[PDB]
């Protein structure tokens, strides 16, 4: 899929429906032509002064006056570098970058990979660029590695992995933001002369006011046709989305990661690896977008052994921090599994190993809440090694422990997996709720210094590296109460993590690029049947006590069990995700799913406000099969495909007012005969 | 005036106009209350983490998660930073800055001014925060300065000039962009979360992309009411104008030097000073602001010389053709040059060799010279602690050699032509060099003086380019007989346009294809008014143009340039009829007019 | 106020705020001139000066006109051409009133003036007057227009419109007041193309039932606090149409009146026609002064005397009791519910003896009672069976003619009989049914044209008898619909019936209609004091059941009658009502009234939607002088009135959250010093 022409010295990124053109200027630089729908191939694109080209990977210090994307220091003090193409080859399947998360390829010709280095002669270091095109998807991914073969001593201030330009300013940017509670709403803006990006300075975890994702779309898209273009990061800590846009009408967008305190530093035989970016391009609609991350991310990125299989129901509980008292546990599990039918019970707090046998000899599953810092009373570190903690001396503190160090990370690892090592624990639960603050190293020189978020963050990914490959038949949640670690990264690692009108409003707004298996969805102490309704939609839980509850809502909850296990394996692991009606711009949401044979359907339909002497309702579905006889249900009658996608499906106000107040909600069940 | 409050820590400063109000917190930090109209005092403004509440100079690194204003390296290679409020004082007047162009009072009853010192114990640094208010206009400036008392290096990677927030994000940012040929063209765009800006990376010309200069206003403020603020930059190197707001509704706009490749070093007993930004508040539209920068410049900027004084007609191509004096007062070849005195590619300022031999140079040799500069910069190196310190180095260069020479001559105008537009430039060359001129003169209007534009007349017919040529300097690049009568007119307007007037914007050529101007004496004697058209239409609807700034007594004559008398308040509201394909397309398209209104 | 300037033959009207300047063309026809700001006279305006294009008041068709026209009348001949000439003016001093419609009123005739001008046809020898009118002090100008027969020649008018106002530009918006029942009067603002935009009412009774008649016209950036804007109002009850119609040459044209669907009056020799009134008001701050001239000017000058200056009594309403016709129960109630609360008024549904008794427990008196209704079984159907409205051959499904003279006579004598014997002081009237087969059994073929306007003029007499005869009985015109709220009815009854879905009707509403007109009323989720909080501003009134409440709800209902009764003097008779912030655009709603002199006022602030880590606010109120210090809050503190302007109120978040879920509110109070 990928070929050289050697004549007009070029390239081409085959596909089904992607095209890829790149080109070897005079200077030595690489330049881009095309990046769309695809292009029969051509012998010959001749036919198609810096600051007026379209470049690959820019760099400050010549004609070109705009933002840059790389930046040097050596040490002479100098930040000017340039540097041309020496070699290429063309590979087959993806290699991996070692030290930080990405894709993989299962068989060899799923994919294929170039592999194109260039050399700089006066501090002699190497630039390694890498593209990478899957068949059967229209999705394209790049990176960058430095390594530095002189003696010269030379410092790295900025280092972004990608970097996309066009020829036209007219589109419409996307982007996901919000504060916790009310996070990933949608916002979009028009382009216009100058700079506009989004960022991260939240240290510990990854964005919790910005998402790791941009996108860039015609002003007529819709969720069913236009052009659109989506760029993702995978990485979990600072980072920074930049779009700008020149007078002369070019536009031109790079991913990173943040250089607000990058300073990273390099020597002979030494090397640099950058985080992977992932590029879609649709030609129908968010809708094909959405779908193909959502494959993508539930096929090729997430842990084997979970791919096919479905999420079991956990059934967590609240209290008031009470004793450690053995017969209430025991008989609670015994009352919520004997009657309600659920598969897994978790225990919070610290409120062991002699427990977690009988609640498995019961019929039932077992998991932890647990939590990786340190406190300055009783932790015993504080006066066993106070070095250990963070904080710069002479600054007064306001604790997370220090994940730079490779000492703490084993401390951790030998004294968890004495926990993890004689008990039948199946679930664990990860939390963290604390910002970085002062992020200092006292482990570590004053040339060094700089270095510590990309260290904490390689630290917490190999931690999990080796407690995963240790023990490879439990399950993860990836955040407990900070909401902030909704990235690519964390599904790689914890296939799962945490997120009524709210609930809504969040999911419709988080389901643009990530599956709808990793959100995690729970009912707590409006009616049940509307909280059930919207949360049937992705992993299903239940915080409730049994004891508060009547014998009516232990039917209906029984009713809600049976209805999800026999549903959720077309909901989690066989659907495509189809959204219908907007939160935004009105009051009504709607979305559906259907089998990737158009065989069964589940529809669902939301209102926020009510509405008194108002319009009747049509409700017009997608994705069905032309030429069908469907079965309609939830009173049944039968209808074609091609009219029930085109005139809807008559709603009946009144009825919706019936079954509440402000949010009422109704489900419809498809069929094939 | 400025009071201190000693019993609640407050200070209020105003000009009876508008009303400031600042607060020492409980950490020594300081805190900002109110910035607006002006308003009344009381004893006891009490009732009105670190990321939430509202600092007027932001460090990142104790809670903050925003883009900071301040960032310092010291040794033990952190970049952690505090300071706190150790004592204060008031002046009279303006001291002023000494190495760098700043704003000058000259009685002492016209500025006060507040100075407030914080103060680092780890690393030994001062820091001092200067106001100033002025009497009878509604500015204030803002700067900073940095002290070293220990012993210990430190460097300075990022250090701004401002940082005022607000409390709501409803508001509608407001640029001047544009490219060679085309430039300062007005643009709007609506606020949202994230960070939108404009900077510049050029070199050594003053933002050749985007004009340091923004501005913030409702979404319905138009140019006769409504609220406005405005900032703009006293500066020549590569800028910065951030626009931050938050989750919580919380902007923060942010001014100053770029931070790209700018890296200083403090060594004991050294100081840094930074540029001066001026912010200005109306309540009435866009021309009240425009009025209060134009006063302002031309009043305690330009030279003292250059000042109650209008400019020379000029012209441009020996003795056989300055036989030719049909008016003309000034040949350019009294007597002007032009020289080129940084490319030989391009010199170094930052050291003072090529200053001394250029000054020496160009002495030997030494009523009207001008100054050319076409290449940007390549290539920032120079002949290893202090290789970030060129482009402020070349900056100060280029300023100091000003400075010497206008020491030196001082009756000789100069000009510049690159778009270094800057407002530093007028403090040392008092007027610079500039149908499609149009629209670039509607932009420029917005916060430079017109004296400060160069016009000139090239070689449609020349009626219409003489008269977009009025408004500014007028210069030159049957017929002859109709020159003659240009200059005249010319001649008898300049000290109304150029010295004594307000300059008011009627119509606007975005949105429309009409433009709109005019003056006005300060007192309601004279005015004079055009009126532009673009493209010529048919079946078009009646004209009838108003006017504004006008007294609403006594009595005018119209003559339409048929003479009528009518009253100021018709003239606001009715307006003066214009008849369509009678007269504008008696001369075709492009078509123009004038008017005058004598008062009694 | 008035000049003319007989050497160029020109009006001019002004008032020290507006200016009106008319000019007699050389054809005998009328050309508009200015309107607008006010002028200072000159001795001449000839400067200022194809029928189609120059802009007259009152437009004809035919004779070069190709814009819709404003009259059209129809002779024997078959012809529908006419023509008019100046011929006479007149001047004098006060308003002189429309006899069969009603209008406003002047009472010192020196707040007022008049101009008469009057315009002849010789084809057909009939004349027709139009009269202008100017209020000092005031900037408002009203006008309409008559019509008289001279010569023997019959003429059948179809076309009759009450004004017509015209500009030059076409740079405004359209703003209107639309809704159906239970969301009635809400605001859409509309731009304006080449075309026809138009809002008209087909209903046959009540009218005003899905588009009040009023209609504004305001520049694009005018808000709350500054710009242009102009106001077109209506007195009429009927079938209206308001049309506005721009050119493509660029010139408005905005006209009022009768919807001439089914309007077919014909003049003989001798006899007359009068038009309905049209009311314009030009403001040069914006939307809050347009509605404080509207305000004062219908609470002054054209309410019924008697009423204009007493606060309206606390009623209290039993709809509730169901339908048992027994007795002492009332008595019961109103001994020791309503007295003991503290209403004054006690208002039954549905004797006279009862009456008497109880007003010795010191209450006044109400009854309900629907009047223009019949049903088949009525002893009035068997003995008059074609006093009906309807057609021969045709179904229906009773309304009950007012065309004819028989019926009002019959009804006014059966309802004075039930008047004179009871104490009654309190009578609300009833309609809930529209028209249909708009036919009259009485009249002839040539009669059977008019019916609709007729009976309007029919139920106007009826009250002007029936008010004439008991000076003393409030009324309120609805019960069911709210479709009669117009000033003619005001004219007549002072006002009328009318949380969320209630705090926008009444914000809506606000725009053209005193807030002592509102009927506002508490019923019984939602707390009761939030209910009150909007109640409150309005009329105020109880409908609930006091048997069935317990003892913290009438320990809390006594305080609001107290506080009610302590503002209610502030809050109808006089002060300025001031609106901050819209439901429109936010999810918030403000507004305050101010006394006449800067003295006191109350304030008041709601929202809709509850929210969680939101953002600071600052409810800042306007309409205040900068002079002294005055605050309460409810502890107090105290400010200046411009601080107060500028800076405003500062509101804790949390503060709204304990006052109650999703509905909060809060109430101010100011003062002197």
Redesign the interface.
């Known amino acids: 899929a990928v070929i050289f022409h050697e004549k007009t010295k070029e390239f081409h990124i085959f596909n089904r429906e992607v095209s890829y053109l790149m080109r070897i200027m005079e200077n030595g630089q690489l330049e881009n032509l095309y990046y769309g729908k695809v292009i029969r191939d051509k012998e010959d694109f001749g036919y198609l002064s810096m600051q007026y080209t379209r470049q690959e990977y820019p760099v400050?210090?010549?004609?070109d006056?705009?933002?840059p994307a790389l930046t040097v220091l050596q040490?002479?003090?100098?930040?000017?570098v340039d540097f041309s193409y020496v070699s290429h080859e063309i590979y087959k399947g993806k290699k991996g970058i070692p030290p930080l998360p990405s894709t993989y390829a299962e068989s060899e010709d799923e994919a294929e990979t170039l592999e194109v280095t260039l050399h700089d002669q006066v501090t002699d270091t190497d630039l390694v660029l890498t593209y990478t095109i899957y068949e059967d998807y229209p999705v394209i991914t790049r990176n960058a590695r430095f390594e530095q073969k002189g003696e010269q001593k030379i410092v790295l201030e900025r280092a972004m992995s990608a970097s996309v330009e066009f020829l036209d300013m007219d589109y419409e940017l996307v982007?996901l933001?919000?504060?916790?509670?009310?996070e990933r709403y949608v916002?979009n803006?028009?382009l216009?002369?100058?700079?506009?990006?989004?960022?991260s300075?939240?240290g510990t975890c990854g964005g919790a006011?910005?998402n790791p994702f941009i996108a860039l779309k015609r002003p007529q898209t819709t969720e069913n046709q236009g052009e659109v273009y989506g760029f993702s990061l995978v990485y979990s800590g600072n980072f920074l989305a930049q779009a700008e846009v020149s007078?002369?009408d070019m536009t031109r967008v790079m991913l990173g990661i943040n250089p607000e305190?990058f300073s990273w530093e390099l020597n002979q035989g030494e090397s640099f690896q950058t985080p992977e970016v992932v590029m879609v391009y649709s030609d129908r609609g968010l809708n094909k977008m959405s779908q193909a991350y959502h494959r993508l991310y539930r096929t090729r990125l997430m842990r084997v052994t979970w791919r096919d299989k479905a999420r079991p129901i956990l059934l967590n509980n609240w209290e008031a921090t009470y004793f450690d008292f053995n017969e209430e546990k025991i008989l609670k599990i015994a009352e919520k599994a004997k009657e309600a039918g659920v598969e897994l019970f978790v225990l919070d707090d610290g409120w062991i190993a002699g427990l977690s046998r009988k609640v498995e000899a019961l019929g039932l599953k077992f998991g932890l809440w647990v939590e990786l810092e340190m406190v300055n009373k009783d932790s015993d570190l504080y006066r066993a090694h106070p070095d250990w903690l963070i904080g710069?001396?002479?600054?007064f503190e306001?604790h997370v422990l220090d994940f730079s160090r490779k000492e703490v990370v084993d401390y951790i690892y030998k004294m968890i997996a004495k926990v993890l090592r004689e008990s039948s624990i199946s679930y664990i639960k990860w939390d963290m709720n604390r910002?970085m603050?002062?992020?200092?190293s006292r482990g570590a020189?004053?040339?060094?210094?700089?270095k510590v978020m990309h260290k904490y963050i390689l630290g917490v990914y190999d931690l999990y590296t080796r407690l995963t490959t240790e023990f490879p038949e439990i399950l993860f949640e990836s955040c407990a109460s900070g909401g902030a670690r909704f990235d690519p990264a964390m599904l790689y690692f914890a296939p799962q993590t945490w997120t009524a009108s709210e609930r809504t409003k969040i999911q419709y707004g988080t389901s643009y690029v990530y599956p709808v298996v990793s959100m995690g969805s729970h009912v707590s102490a409006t009616p049940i049947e509307t909280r059930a309704n919207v949360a049937y939609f992705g992993t299903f839980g239940y915080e409730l006590d049994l004891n508060l509850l009547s014998e009516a809502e232990l039917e209906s909850v029984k009713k809600q069990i049976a209805f999800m296990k026999e549903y959720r394996e077309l909901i989690q692991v066989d659907g495509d995700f189809y959204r219908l009606l907007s939160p935004f711009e009105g009051n009504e949401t709607a979305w559906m799913v259907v089998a990737q044979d158009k065989s069964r359907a589940v529809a669902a339909f939301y209102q926020r406000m009510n509405k008194?002497?108002a319009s009747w309702i049509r409700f017009k579905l997608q994705g069905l099969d032309a030429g069908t006889l469907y079965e309609v249900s939830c009173k049944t009658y039968r209808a074609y495909g091609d009219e029930l996608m085109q005139v809807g499906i008559p709603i009946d106000r009144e009825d919706l007012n019936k079954k509440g107040?402000d949010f009422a909600s109704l489900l419809y069940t498809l069929k094939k005969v």
């Open positions: 400050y210090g010549t004609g006056y705009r933002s040490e002479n003090g100098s930040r000017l982007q933001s919000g504060a916790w509670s009310r916002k803006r028009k216009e002369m100058g700079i506009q990006s989004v960022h300075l939240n006011e910005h007078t002369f305190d710069a001396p002479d600054r306001s910002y603050t002062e992020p200092y020189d004053a040339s060094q210094q700089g008194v002497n107040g």
